[PDB]
Amino acid sequence: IGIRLTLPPPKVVDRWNEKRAMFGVYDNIGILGNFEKHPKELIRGPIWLRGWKGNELQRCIRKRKMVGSRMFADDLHNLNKRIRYLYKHFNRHGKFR
Amino acid sequence: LRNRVTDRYFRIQEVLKHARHFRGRKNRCYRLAVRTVIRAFVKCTKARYLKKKNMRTLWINRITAASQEHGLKYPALIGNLVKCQVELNRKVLADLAIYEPKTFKSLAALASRRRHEGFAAALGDGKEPEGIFSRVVQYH
Amino acid sequence: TARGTPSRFLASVLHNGLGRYVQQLQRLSFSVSRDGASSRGAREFVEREVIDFARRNPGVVIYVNSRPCCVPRVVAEYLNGAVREESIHCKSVEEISTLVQKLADQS
Amino acid sequence: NFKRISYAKTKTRAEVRGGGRKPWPQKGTGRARHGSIRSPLWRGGGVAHGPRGPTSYYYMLPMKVRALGLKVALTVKLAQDDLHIMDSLELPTGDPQYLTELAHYRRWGDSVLLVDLTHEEMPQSIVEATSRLKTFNLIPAVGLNVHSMLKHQTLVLTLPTVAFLEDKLLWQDSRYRPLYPFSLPYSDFP
Amino acid sequence: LTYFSARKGKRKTVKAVIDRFLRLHCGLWVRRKAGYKKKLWKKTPARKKRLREFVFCNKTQSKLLDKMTTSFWKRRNWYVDDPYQKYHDRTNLKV
Amino acid sequence: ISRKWEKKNKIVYPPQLPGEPRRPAEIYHCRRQIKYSKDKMWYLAKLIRGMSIDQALAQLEFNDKKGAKIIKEVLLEAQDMAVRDHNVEFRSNLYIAESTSGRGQCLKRIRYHGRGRFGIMEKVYCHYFVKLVEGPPPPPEPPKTAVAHAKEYIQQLRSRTIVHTL
Amino acid sequence: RGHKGERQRGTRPRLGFEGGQTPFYIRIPKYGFNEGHSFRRQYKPLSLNRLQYLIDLGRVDPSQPIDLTQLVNGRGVTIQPLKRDYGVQLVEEGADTFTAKVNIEVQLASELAIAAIEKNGGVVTTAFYDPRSLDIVCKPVPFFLRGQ
Amino acid sequence: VKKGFRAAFRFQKELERQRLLRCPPPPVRRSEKPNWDYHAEIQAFGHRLQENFSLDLLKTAFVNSCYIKSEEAKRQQLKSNQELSEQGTSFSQTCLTQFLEDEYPDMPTEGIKNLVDFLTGEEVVCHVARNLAVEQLTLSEEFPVPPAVLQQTFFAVIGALLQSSGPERTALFIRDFLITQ
RNA sequence: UCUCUUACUUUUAACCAGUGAAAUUGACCUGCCCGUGAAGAGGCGGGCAUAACACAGCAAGACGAGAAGACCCUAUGGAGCU
RNA sequence: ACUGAACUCCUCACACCCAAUUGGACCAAUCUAUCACCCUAUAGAAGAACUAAUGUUAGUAUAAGUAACAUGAAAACAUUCU
RNA sequence: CCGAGCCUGGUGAUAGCUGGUUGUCCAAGAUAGAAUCUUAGUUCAACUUUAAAUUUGCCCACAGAACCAAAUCCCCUU
RNA sequence: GCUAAACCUAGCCCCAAACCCACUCCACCUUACUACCAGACAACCUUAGCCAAACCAUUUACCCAAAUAAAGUAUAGGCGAUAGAAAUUGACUGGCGCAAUAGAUAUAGUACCGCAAGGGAAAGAUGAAAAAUUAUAACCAAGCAUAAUAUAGCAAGGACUAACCCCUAUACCUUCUGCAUAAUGAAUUAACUAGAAAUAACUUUGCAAGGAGAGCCAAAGCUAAGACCCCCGAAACCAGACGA
Numbered sequence A: 001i002g003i004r005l006t007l008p009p010p011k012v013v014d015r016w017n018e019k020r021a022m023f024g025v026y027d028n029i030g031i032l033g034n035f036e037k038h039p040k041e042l043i044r045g046p047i048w049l050r051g052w053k054g055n056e057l058q059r060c061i062r063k064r065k066m067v068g069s070r071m072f073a074d075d076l077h078n079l080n081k082r083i084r085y086l087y088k089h090f091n092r093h094g095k096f097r
Numbered sequence B: 001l002r003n004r005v006t007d008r009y010f011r012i013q014e015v016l017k018h019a020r021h022f023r024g025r026k027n028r029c030y031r032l033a034v035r036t037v038i039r040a041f042v043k044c045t046k047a048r049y050l051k052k053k054n055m056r057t058l059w060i061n062r063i064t065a066a067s068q069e070h071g072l073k074y075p076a077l078i079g080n081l082v083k084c085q086v087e088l089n090r091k092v093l094a095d096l097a098i099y100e101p102k103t104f105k106s107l108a109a110l111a112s113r114r115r116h117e118g119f120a121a122a123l124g125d126g127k128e129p130e131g132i133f134s135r136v137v138q139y140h
Numbered sequence C: 001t002a003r004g005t006p007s008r009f010l011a012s013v014l015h016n017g018l019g020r021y022v023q024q025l026q027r028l029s030f031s032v033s034r035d036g037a038s039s040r041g042a043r044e045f046v047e048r049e050v051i052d053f054a055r056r057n058p059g060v061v062i063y064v065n066s067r068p069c070c071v072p073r074v075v076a077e078y079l080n081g082a083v084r085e086e087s088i089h090c091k092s093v094e095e096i097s098t099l100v101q102k103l104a105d106q107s
Numbered sequence D: 001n002f003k004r005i006s007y008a009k010t011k012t013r014a015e016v017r018g019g020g021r022k023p024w025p026q027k028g029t030g031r032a033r034h035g036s037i038r039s040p041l042w043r044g045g046g047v048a049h050g051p052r053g054p055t056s057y058y059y060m061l062p063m064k065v066r067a068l069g070l071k072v073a074l075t076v077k078l079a080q081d082d083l084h085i086m087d088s089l090e091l092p093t094g095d096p097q098y099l100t101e102l103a104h105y106r107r108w109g110d111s112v113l114l115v116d117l118t119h120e121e122m123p124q125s126i127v128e129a130t131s132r133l134k135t136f137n138l139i140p141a142v143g144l145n146v147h148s149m150l151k152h153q154t155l156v157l158t159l160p161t162v163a164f165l166e167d168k169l170l171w172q173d174s175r176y177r178p179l180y181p182f183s184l185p186y187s188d189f190p
Numbered sequence E: 001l002t003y004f005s006a007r008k009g010k011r012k013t014v015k016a017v018i019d020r021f022l023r024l025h026c027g028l029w030v031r032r033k034a035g036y037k038k039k040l041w042k043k044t045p046a047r048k049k050r051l052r053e054f055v056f057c058n059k060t061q062s063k064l065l066d067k068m069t070t071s072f073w074k075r076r077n078w079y080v081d082d083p084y085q086k087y088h089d090r091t092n093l094k095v
Numbered sequence F: 001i002s003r004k005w006e007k008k009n010k011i012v013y014p015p016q017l018p019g020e021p022r023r024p025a026e027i028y029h030c031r032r033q034i035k036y037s038k039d040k041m042w043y044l045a046k047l048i049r050g051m052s053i054d055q056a057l058a059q060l061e062f063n064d065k066k067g068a069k070i071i072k073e074v075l076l077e078a079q080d081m082a083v084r085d086h087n088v089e090f091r092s093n094l095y096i097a098e099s100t101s102g103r104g105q106c107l108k109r110i111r112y113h114g115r116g117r118f119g120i121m122e123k124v125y126c127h128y129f130v131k132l133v134e135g136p137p138p139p140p141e142p143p144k145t146a147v148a149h150a151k152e153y154i155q156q157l158r159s160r161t162i163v164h165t166l
Numbered sequence G: 001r002g003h004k005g006e007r008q009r010g011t012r013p014r015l016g017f018e019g020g021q022t023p024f025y026i027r028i029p030k031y032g033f034n035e036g037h038s039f040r041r042q043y044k045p046l047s048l049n050r051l052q053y054l055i056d057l058g059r060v061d062p063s064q065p066i067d068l069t070q071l072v073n074g075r076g077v078t079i080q081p082l083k084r085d086y087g088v089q090l091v092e093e094g095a096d097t098f099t100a101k102v103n104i105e106v107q108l109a110s111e112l113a114i115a116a117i118e119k120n121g122g123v124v125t126t127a128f129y130d131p132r133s134l135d136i137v138c139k140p141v142p143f144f145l146r147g148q
Numbered sequence H: 001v002k003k004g005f006r007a008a009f010r011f012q013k014e015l016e017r018q019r020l021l022r023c024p025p026p027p028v029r030r031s032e033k034p035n036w037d038y039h040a041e042i043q044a045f046g047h048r049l050q051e052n053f054s055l056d057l058l059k060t061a062f063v064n065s066c067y068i069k070s071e072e073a074k075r076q077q078l079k080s081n082q083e084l085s086e087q088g089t090s091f092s093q094t095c096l097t098q099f100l101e102d103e104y105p106d107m108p109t110e111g112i113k114n115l116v117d118f119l120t121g122e123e124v125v126c127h128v129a130r131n132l133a134v135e136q137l138t139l140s141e142e143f144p145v146p147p148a149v150l151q152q153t154f155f156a157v158i159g160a161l162l163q164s165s166g167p168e169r170t171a172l173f174i175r176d177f178l179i180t181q
Numbered sequence I: 001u002c003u004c005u006u007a008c009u010u011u012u013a014a015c016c017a018g019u020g021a022a023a024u025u026g027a028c029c030u031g032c033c034c035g036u037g038a039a040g041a042g043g044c045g046g047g048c049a050u051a052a053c054a055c056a057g058c059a060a061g062a063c064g065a066g067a068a069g070a071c072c073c074u075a076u077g078g079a080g081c082u
Numbered sequence J: 001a002c003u004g005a006a007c008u009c010c011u012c013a014c015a016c017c018c019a020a021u022u023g024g025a026c027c028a029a030u031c032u033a034u035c036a037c038c039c040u041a042u043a044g045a046a047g048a049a050c051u052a053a054u055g056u057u058a059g060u061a062u063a064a065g066u067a068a069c070a071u072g073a074a075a076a077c078a079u080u081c082u
Numbered sequence K: 001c002c003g004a005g006c007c008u009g010g011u012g013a014u015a016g017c018u019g020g021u022u023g024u025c026c027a028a029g030a031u032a033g034a035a036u037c038u039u040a041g042u043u044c045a046a047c048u049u050u051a052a053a054u055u056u057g058c059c060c061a062c063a064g065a066a067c068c069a070a071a072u073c074c075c076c077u078u
Numbered sequence L: 001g002c003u004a005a006a007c008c009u010a011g012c013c014c015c016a017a018a019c020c021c022a023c024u025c026c027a028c029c030u031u032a033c034u035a036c037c038a039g040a041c042a043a044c045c046u047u048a049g050c051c052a053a054a055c056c057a058u059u060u061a062c063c064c065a066a067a068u069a070a071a072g073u074a075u076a077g078g079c080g081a082u083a084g085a086a087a088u089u090g091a092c093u094g095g096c097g098c099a100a101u102a103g104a105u106a107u108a109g110u111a112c113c114g115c116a117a118g119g120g121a122a123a124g125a126u127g128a129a130a131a132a133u134u135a136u137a138a139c140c141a142a143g144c145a146u147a148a149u150a151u152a153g154c155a156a157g158g159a160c161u162a163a164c165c166c167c168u169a170u171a172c173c174u175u176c177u178g179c180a181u182a183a184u185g186a187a188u189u190a191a192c193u194a195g196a197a198a199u200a201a202c203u204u205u206g207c208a209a210g211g212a213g214a215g216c217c218a219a220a221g222c223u224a225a226g227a228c229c230c231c232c233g234a235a236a237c238c239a240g241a242c243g244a
C-alpha cells in the first residue's frame, strides 16, 4: 500500500516575505536607468550560466571552458565523458537527419 | 525522485470495483482484473444486439405456441394479420397470447378467415367480390 | 455492468399521478463560496436563477449556505428519504440550471 | 523565468559508483541479460532522463515589448482605479499604523506599491513606515516592474515619478534602431 | 553532418556542397552537369553543349543543400561585378 | 505487527436492564510466536471448534501433536482467566466459539543444495487464537431432511414468474 | 518512430548518404562558384531614391558634406566590415526624380548616379576606405572608447 | 514518503466513508440534521400537497402529547393533535365508507369495515405519512416516530385540512392518498 | 547374461511424530470422439460424457521442465589458425 | 410463405469502430506565481502517469507440509549390554 | 566456462539484430518503382498526413492513335 | 485478524564563497605497525583502442589560460567522414534540488566475496515525559484465516424470482501474409523503470524599410516565444595493474 494514512504537516506560506514582496524589482533597470546595467547582470548563479541559456551539450562545453581548469578531477573526467556521449548522441542518433 | 504518482490507489480501485464479483485472483489482482474487466465491458456492449435478437426469438416462439394451440401456424397468423391491415408487433402479440387469450383467439380466427378468403380468391381466379375481411382501407 | 450492479423494477413513490401529481423533490441545499474560482457559476446562479426556480417550485425548500468551500455542491433530498449529492464545481450557470431542473424532475 | 537557474542534477549511469563489470554471463543462466548493475533498470542505478547540471532559463524579450508592458500595467491601474498620483511621499509621523489607517480610510487595497523618484532622496518618514509594513512596499522609480504592480492591489506614484516614467517610456516610441548599446555616448542621450 | 560542434556547439557546413554548388539568394541552387570534361571525343556537339550548361536543382536537392550549409551561405552578397547578380532575385513568378 | 485480540478482553459493556437476557461471557486468549506451522495448527484448531472446554481438553490431551500440547496450555490458561477475571461461575460452562491460527514473524535461513546452489528455508512461527463463550456447546446444525428438501423445491416451483412479459 | 530497423533504433545514416549510391552532392563535379568568396569586396547599394528619401525626411543634412559616417548615423545604410563590406556604392535608381544638391563621398559610383548629382549641381567623389578605417568611419564612438 | 496533499485528503475521505459503513451512526431526526427551517418546511408541505392549509392548524397537527410532556420535563431541568386527530379519523372512516359503498354496492358491511380498516390502518397510514414528509415534521419524544404517533399525526392533518378547506377537498385528498393505496 | 524368472534380507518406500527445500507457475470452473484451424485442440463446430472430494501408482499427452539450438542460414557481427 | 445483420426504416441522439504514421481536443498528480482554504482556480514549469523488457529490489504464494534430514538397547540415569 | 587469464579503466564500446517503450477521447490513413558490398537496411520516387494558394478534377462522344481478344489512350456533354 | 501497512528525519545534490590537510607518549619500508649494527639499488620515452567513415587500410572534436563577436569564415581532409583558426573585438550563506528502492556506495569502503588487484551491501521511524508500556485503537497490497467443495468448460456477459443451470463468447502482449495457437514474455503484490535538438517551416505578440540591449540579417523584413527527434542487451578491441 503506497498512500499516507494521515494528512501531511500543513504547508504555511508567507506570500509577503521580503523576497516574494520584492520579486521583480529592478528588472527594468536598463530601460528605466539610461541603460547603464542589464538584467543579465542582475542574474546570480554559476559563472558559466550568467545571461546564457544553451542546451546540455552547449552547457557542458561552456563549463569546461570557463572553469575546467579550476575543477576537481573526478568531476572533470565525468564532464569529458559527458561531452563525448552527448556529441555521439546529438550528431549521430535521432529520427530527423 | 521528483514527481511521483500519489493517487495510483484510486486508479487501481477505479478498475478493481468492477471485478469484485469475479472468481479467483482476478477479482483482486490488478494485472489479471484489467484483462477481464475490459472483456466484461465489451461483452456488455455487444450483448445489447444479442438481447434484441433473443427477445424477438422468444416472442416468435411464444406466438408459435399460441397459434398451434389454435390450430394455426405462425407464418399464417403473421401474414394474414398483415393482410388484414393489423399492425400489431410480435411483442404485443406474445403479450396477448399470455394475458388476453380471448383476444388472441379472436386474432387467430381473423387470420384463419383471411387465409380462407385468400384461398377462395385464388381458386376463383376471376372477379368474384373481394371478400369482407380482404378489403383494404385506402389512405390518401 | 448489469450482472455487476443492483437492479429494480419500474415504480413510483406513492402511486404518483393516479389521483394527483406530487413533486418528489423536498429540499435543495446549495453550498457556495464568496471568493472561490470554482464557485463562479454557483454565485451567478444564486444571483440570477435561484429566485425564479424557487417561485416556480413552491413545494421545494432551497437553502443557500455561503461558506468557504473548494467544491460547491447541491444536496437534493426527496420525499422517499433519498439524498443526491452533486458537485457544481466549475460549472456555468446554464449547466447549474439544467442540473437543478433535472433534480426537480427526478424522483 | 529569465533569471532562473535550476540546480537539480541527477547522476547518469556513467556517474554512479561501481557498475563496470558485467554481473553474470550473457548466456547459460536463466536470468535477464545485464551489462552493468548501475543501469537505469536497477535499484541504485543511474537516471535515464533526469535533470542535468545547473540549467539557465535565460532569455530576453525585446525592450520595446518590455516598455510596452510597463505602459499597459500603468494604464490598467488607472483604468481600474488602482492608481494614486501624489505630490510627495512625506508622512507627518513616520508611523506604520498611520500609513495603514490612511490606506484603509482612502479605501486602497490590502497591498500598496509606493514609488518615489530616487532611492537616495526618499523621505525618512516613508522609509520608517515601509520598513515594518510587509504589504506596503516602497521602491525607487528605477525599480518599477509589471510583477510588482500586479502583486500590489494599489500603486501610489509621485509626480516626479510620473514625468520620469513618461520620458523613459516615450523615448522608446520616438527612438531609432540602436547602432551600438545606449551605454555608449550618442549625441542626445544622457 | 555535425549538428552541434564540440568547440563551439554549432552546426557545420559540408564543404563538398560549397565546392560544388552555387546558391542564389532567391533559394535556387546551380550546378554543372556531370561528365562535362570527360570522354568528349565520343560526345556529339549537342550533347556537349547540354553538358556545358549551368543547370538548376530540385526542390528536394535544394532543401538538402540548404540543410547541409549554414546560414552564412544564404545571406545577400553585394559583390562588385558578380555575374549572377541578375539571378539573385525572381521576377514575374506566380505561385 | 497487529495485536488486537488482547484488547478485546477489555470491552466494558453498559450495565444490563433487569428484564434482558443475561449476556454470556466472552473470553479472548491467544499465544504469539509459536515454533510451529500455521497449516498444522489449523487442523488442531478446526478439530477443537465448537466443542465444550472439557471435551476439547480431552481431545488435545490424547492428540499426538506438539500443537495439541500448546493449545491445551492456552485453553487451560483461558479457562483460568474466565473464572478468575471475567466472572464465569462454572469452569465447565464454556465452549470454543472461535479457534484459528495465524502466520507469525518468521526467519529466513540458507539451505545449501548441491552444485553451487542454495535454497532459502523458513523458520516458521505461528499464532493461536481462541474465544471462549459461557454456556453449553451450541446444538449442531441437524442434517437436511427430505421434507426440508421438498419444501425448498416446491417454494421454487411456486416462485417462478413469467419471464420477459408484462 | 516506426517498427524496426535504423528508423526505430535511431541509427539511420547521415544527411546526404543515399544507401550506397554515389551521392548527389558528390557526383556533381566541382566548379569554382565560391572560390575566393571571402576576399571578394562588397559594396552596399545606396540608391538615389533612398538618398532623396533620407534627405526629405531630414535624416541626412544636405548643407554639409555627406560621407559614410553621415549615412550610417542617419541610418540609411548598414555596413558590415566583417562581411567584407568596403563601403557604399551609389547606384542609378531614382536618377529621374533626384532633385538635390549634395557633396557626397562614396566608394563606388555609376556614371548615371554621378551625372544626376552633377545636373542638380553637386559634387560626387569616390574614396577608398581600408577595412579598419571603414570600421572607424562607420562606428567612430567605439574607436574613441578604445582610445588609441 | 511521497510529496503532496490531494491523494492523502482523498484517502482520508475514503477512510471516513468506510468507518461509517462499518460502525453506522444512529438514526437522527431531520430537525437536528443541519439545513432545516420549520416554518418553510410547513409551507412547503402545504404547497406540494397543493392544499391551502391554515398554518396554525397544521402546526398543531404535528404537536403530540409526548412532546408537550417531554419538553415540560426539560423545562423542569401547547395544544395537541387530539381534537384534530379524532375529527380527521372520524371523517376518514365516514368518507372512505361512503366511497367504498358507492363503488362496490354489493359488498356486505363487514367487508367495507375491513377495507376501511386497511386503508385507515397502521401500515398503510405510516407508509403514506413517511413518504409524504409527515415524520420529518412530527414533533414527538422518540425517533423513529412510533407508528401509533405517526397515525395520530397523519389523521390530524386530515382534521386540519377538513377545518381549513372543507369536506369536499379533504375527501379528494383521502381519495388521492388512501384509495390509491 | 539369457530361456524365464522366483525367494529372502537391508536401503528406499507407505503410515505416525518433529524439522522443512528446488526447478516450474498468464489466468483456469483444466473431459472423450470426429471435423476444423498458423496445416497435430481440454478451451472452435457437431456429437457424447458428466454429483463432490482425498490417498497410492503410471508415464500416452499438456508440441511436459531445463538451457534466448551445439546443427543450417543471415549480419557490410567477432575471434583463432594458415 | 416465414425466419434471417451493426443493411434500411422507425422514437430520440449523433465527433464517438483500421496497423505503421500523421492532425486535434482534453487531462491525473507534483512544484512554483498569484489565488484558494474539507482540496480548488488561472498560468508557469517538469525526474509529469506502466496488465508485459527470461527487467531491478523487496514481500508473499504454487510446487508442498512434498523432496529430504535425525537418536544402538535397558536401567537406579550409577551403569551395563550389542 | 583459456583458440588466449583476471581486475579496473577507455565504456553509457558498437549492434541495419531480438526484446521493451507508461493518462483519456476524436479524426485522416495500406504501400507503381529506381539505386545501393543491397535486398533483415537506407536514400529518392510513389502512397499517406497537416497547413496554405488557386482552378478545375473524376465520369466521359463524335472525330482520332501501323505496318509487319477482353480492353486501353484521347475526350465535349453530363 | 494475522502477516503487514503508514511515517520525517538522518543525510545528500548543484552552486556561491574561500587556498586544504600533518609532532599525547610509543610503534611502523624486515613478515609494516618489529628498541638496538659495515652499507649503498634508485626518478624521467609520442598512449592506444573502442567508435565514425554505414567494411576498412590515411583520417575520426577531447579544457590549457575569464564571456562575446569575427565564424562554423579562412583553412584542412581516402577534398570523404569529418576537422577547423587567427588578425581584430571587448570581458557567499542560495534552490519552480532529493527525502530511506530517492538523494553520496555509505549507518560503511564496514559486513560479505576474492590469493590478489579488486568488487561491494542491507537497514531507521512512540510520546512532552517510557524516572508515564497505556490499551482504543482500528480501516488499506499480494498471501492467508474467519468460511473447502457440488454436472458445463478464457470463467464473463445478457439476464433472472433465483448463486448456478439457459443462451452468447477461441486470455493478453509482442511478432507476422496470417496466432485460440502447441510461436515470444509473464506466479502475484508494492515501488522503480524508456523521445534529449538543430535547419527550416507554421502559429501568436513587438517594431516595421527597417529589426535587434555592438557582432547579424533585411527587394517585408527582423526580434521574441511556443512547438519534434527513447531504454536494456553481445561476442569483441586497447591501456595499466594483479595473480605460478
Ligand SMILES: C[NH+](C)c1cc(NC(=O)CNC(C)(C)C)c(O)c2c1C[C@H]1C[C@H]3[C@H]([NH+](C)C)C(O)=C(C(N)=O)C(=O)[C@@]3(O)C(O)=C1C2=O
Pocket (backbone or CB within 6 Å): I070, I071
Ligand atoms: C551431447 N554431446 C554428444 C554433444 C553433441 C554436440 N553436437 C553434435 O555432435 C551434433 N548434433 C546435432 C547435429 C546438433 C544434432 C556438441 O556440439 C557438443 C556435445 C557435448 C557438449 C559438452 C559440453 C560441456 N558443458 C556444456 C557441460 C563440457 O563440459 C565441455 C568441456 N570440454 O568442458 C564441452 O566440450 C561442451 O561445452 C561441448 O563443447 C559440447 C558440444 O559441443
Ligand SMILES: [Mg+2]
Pocket (backbone or CB within 6 Å): D013, D014, D015, D018, D019, D020
Ligand atoms: Mg563507469
Ligand SMILES: [Mg+2]
Pocket (backbone or CB within 6 Å): D030, J054
Ligand atoms: Mg526460468
Ligand SMILES: [Mg+2]
Pocket (backbone or CB within 6 Å): D035, D036
Ligand atoms: Mg554493456
Ligand SMILES: [Mg+2]
Pocket (backbone or CB within 6 Å): D044, D045, D046
Ligand atoms: Mg541512485
Ligand SMILES: [Mg+2]
Pocket (backbone or CB within 6 Å): F115
Ligand atoms: Mg562446494
Ligand SMILES: [Mg+2]
Pocket (backbone or CB within 6 Å): G003
Ligand atoms: Mg519492437
Ligand SMILES: [Mg+2]
Pocket (backbone or CB within 6 Å): G004, G005
Ligand atoms: Mg524493417
Ligand SMILES: [Mg+2]
Pocket (backbone or CB within 6 Å): none
Ligand atoms: Mg512427516
Ligand SMILES: [Mg+2]
Pocket (backbone or CB within 6 Å): none
Ligand atoms: Mg514458461
Ligand SMILES: [Mg+2]
Pocket (backbone or CB within 6 Å): I037
Ligand atoms: Mg482461428
Ligand SMILES: [Mg+2]
Pocket (backbone or CB within 6 Å): I041
Ligand atoms: Mg484435432
Ligand SMILES: [Mg+2]
Pocket (backbone or CB within 6 Å): none
Ligand atoms: Mg491447451
Ligand SMILES: [Mg+2]
Pocket (backbone or CB within 6 Å): none
Ligand atoms: Mg495422482
Ligand SMILES: [Mg+2]
Pocket (backbone or CB within 6 Å): none
Ligand atoms: Mg520444452
Ligand SMILES: [Mg+2]
Pocket (backbone or CB within 6 Å): I068
Ligand atoms: Mg537464439
